[PDB]
Amino acid sequence: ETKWQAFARRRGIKPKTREQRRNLQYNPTTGQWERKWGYKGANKRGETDPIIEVSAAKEAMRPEGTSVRGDKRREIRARVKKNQKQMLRNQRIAAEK
Amino acid sequence: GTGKKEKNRLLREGRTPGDPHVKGENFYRSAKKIKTLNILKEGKPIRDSKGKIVKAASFQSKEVPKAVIEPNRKWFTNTRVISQDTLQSFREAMAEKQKDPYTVLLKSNKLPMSLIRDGPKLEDG
Amino acid sequence: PRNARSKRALEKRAPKIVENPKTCLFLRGTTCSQITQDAMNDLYAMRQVHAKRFHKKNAIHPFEDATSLCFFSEKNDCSLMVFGSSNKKRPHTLTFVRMFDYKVLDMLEFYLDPDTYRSISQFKTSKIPIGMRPMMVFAGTAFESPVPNAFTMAKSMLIDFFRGEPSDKIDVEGLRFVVVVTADEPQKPILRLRVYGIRTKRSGTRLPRVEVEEHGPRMDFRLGRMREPDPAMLKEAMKKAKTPQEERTKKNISMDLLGDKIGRIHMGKTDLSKLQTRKMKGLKR
Amino acid sequence: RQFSVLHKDRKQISVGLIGYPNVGKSSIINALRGKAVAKVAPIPGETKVWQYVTLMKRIYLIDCPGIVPPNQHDTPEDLLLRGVVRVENVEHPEQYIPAVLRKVKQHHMERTYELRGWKDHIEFL
Amino acid sequence: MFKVVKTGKKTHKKGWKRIVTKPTFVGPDFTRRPVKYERFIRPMGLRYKKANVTHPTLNVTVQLP
RNA sequence: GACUAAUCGAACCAUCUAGUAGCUGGUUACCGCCGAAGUUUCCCUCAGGAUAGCAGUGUCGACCUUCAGUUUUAUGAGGUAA
RNA sequence: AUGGCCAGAAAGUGGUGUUGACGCAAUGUGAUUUCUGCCCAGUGCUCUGAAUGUCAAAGUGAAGAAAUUCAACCAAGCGCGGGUAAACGGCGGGAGUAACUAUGACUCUCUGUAGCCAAAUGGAUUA
């Protein structure tokens, strides 16, 4: 059992159903079905949109050279790195056991 | 001994440190028991000083959802199929089906009983 | 496993409840005689579908070190091996190797008689089709030893060699070739391997009259050196996995002929001899 | 308990008691519990509402009011002799005495009431 | 969808039970939960088992379970 | 949870004590000059906050620069009618 | 009985007690009649049983120039290992077979128009 599996067994966290964990959601504003993740997913919404309204403090704190169009990719990469590091820790513990 | 505190009880039972707990858990109450007994206390909305509901009660959310059905190829297929050999075997099973008072039915098999049960009598038809 | 094909290969090589048919690797040593090469060729012709063949010279002595055998088994996903050798002490030797979890489970040497050996091409007969499983007959008193010895081991490994793919059904046209292994308890006994083709003739009854005719190869062996399994590894090898498609038996739970789940209740004998009826006023004299 | 083992997948089993009035449903519940948990009276209709009694941790018992399925072949005399109605609220109870005298043997009546020599029900009364 | 079912003898009533006000399908071998642990009440008068189903190609309406 | 001087899920008397309340009620002459406002922006919310904006009194500075919820001209969007 | 149950700020203090198991104190049930479903051993009760496994203060030993640090030692209790008020609890049985014994796992199987037996009665349908 991994760390998450042990925690879910202790806390009584039931696994999500296959209909619940689908990569599909209904966007009301566009009135169209879109994916939560993947190619053209909702987690990268607005990266290709023509108009992006930004906050003056946000480009004030933004470093030179970087733009607002890559912040979502940056945050996704950070989440991927964290999940991968936890997965590698679980694999190392399982190999030790 | 060790102590009647909840921290001492957790250390004695060897729980994982830092694990979240539901409010009201003690020696006599588990998490699922606390949830079951809190179900009986559920049902009252959250109101302000003037009596206006600011947070609704459980399953009284008042919010209108978006009731939409996605296009899917699974809607236009056959969910349940049966073969002619299996149908004939089930017809034979219904043929020498017999009754026994000391056997009870626990779970019925979902079958197309219109294609398995024998037809009505000639005089009735 | 980034590539989907590599993922498929690792999934195929992963342990399963229902195992894949075993793969046999045919290889030879640095010095291997032509008779031994012909014997390996005949065995590969019999088992060509689930076998791989090496074509180089390997400086391996299996009874001294088998690290190279373990490496080859891990790399090729092969659980059976036929290893050819030739020597002054051992002129024509077939080393049958059976392995478990990419480690050597057990090994047995066969010494082939060079004078009585006939290949498949030496018989002008119709041969077995490619991939067809032959029937098996093991004859003699050498295979009924109560203590596990060389002949029982040879029977087991020849069965694993000639199993093929397990199947629930067989066509009656797949009963045309039989492999007969004969050996007797006794100076060393001779294990005789023969293959016959089966023809059927009228006998005037329901059951056909079977006549056999030799197919090849003709092999005579003397059972040689030994490596028996460790008891613990043998126990883990002979453990049998349970298929999900067989139901765990529960008491008083069954399935009837219509597929309904049926529970059985047990009332017991009715004993009213300990019941005292009411002493009503109307029943008193 | 066998039924509970057969339905061990559930949290418990429920056993509802049905029948005519005054057959002994509440008495059976009290006898199985070993404690007077349901009201018992010889008058019909003592149990007016359904009642849950926790027999074991996985067994519940449901007491139900007595029912009478309607039938055109059933007479008020038959219903009264089966015990549906209270005899205090019926009109002319002497007309049902011949049914009782037919149902009961004569010597049983004589030994019950220490009286003999009547010709019919009105003389007996 | 749900209405609050009031339980208790006091003037202040407990309100944890929810009754479904729309037709429901409960399926085969249905045994109702006991009242102490029955939160969602699906009444017997609102249960349906059959529906009038129309086939768009054949233009035939058949009552199906 | 009854009784304990008409006082009881903790009697009565005096004091700390003018205890605390964000809640309720009330908050005393006249005239004159100005005179309002409801996500603007940020923060975990309800039992949340600042903050922009709008105002009045004084001043001071050359009350210097002029600016403007408007039109026109040039050019965008709407090329849409015609 | 240098004891139980109490009380007191304490006391060379008081009560039970001018008392001693046919007594005192604390409980549950509640006349009489009826009456103790079967089976244990999880929580709990207690054990004149092994251990130092957890292990405070004091005490012991070493280093340093000392403050100090590190080690053992560590009573009761807990824990471990036993017998139960078997109270709560849980609880279809009956035979086996085999794993050896700890967890068993597997196989088979369950369906008298007023009597008999009990020290007159067979009762709570209690005056």
Add this chain to the structure above:
RNA sequence: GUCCUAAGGGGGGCUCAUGGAGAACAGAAAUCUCCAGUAGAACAAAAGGGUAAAAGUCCCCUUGAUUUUGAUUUUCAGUGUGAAUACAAACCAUGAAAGUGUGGCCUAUCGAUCCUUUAGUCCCUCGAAAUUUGAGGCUAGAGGUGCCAGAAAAGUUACCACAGGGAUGGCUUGUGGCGGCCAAGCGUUCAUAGCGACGUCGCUUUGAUCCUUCGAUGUCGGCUCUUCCUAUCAUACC
């Protein structure tokens, strides 16, 4: 910082790195043709024998982004039409076919103005003086919840009390829903589509059976007495 009808699957065609010989610019290095080329390229892994009419590279078809069923395996389920999971079958994609292949991979969370830790030589101070330990400040480093510490302050009041705040509508009535067809007409007549009253057609016992009554959160009454409405049971007329 960009770009992509995503990857994958099936089928078909072709052969790669390099060397030599040649071709205006073109000259070591651009593109083209031939020959020789066991893979010495590419793709995956870490061969001591991976792959050559392919596992490489380009075309065609699917891209539907995680299908359905299960009395079966494992786990769970106070929301038990079971859910997740494994296996099997069906389906699907592709190909002429033999066949091949898919129907996911993972993970408790919180702080970074935080936690743990190292060094200061020529840093400063310990305020009666100095030295050696020690301690504080300041500065400069290192790592990131396996070895970076930690993250357990519940109920009840029908025994009660206090300070306050409260207590859809010119609606409705007598004729069902869904789906198809017809249709006077409205439109349209460089598109012949779209609405459509009136209807109609399908689903919802030879006078039977009586052995299928299907859930109180929402509460009404009774007496006495007066008047109004008509949507008329009776009396009057038709």
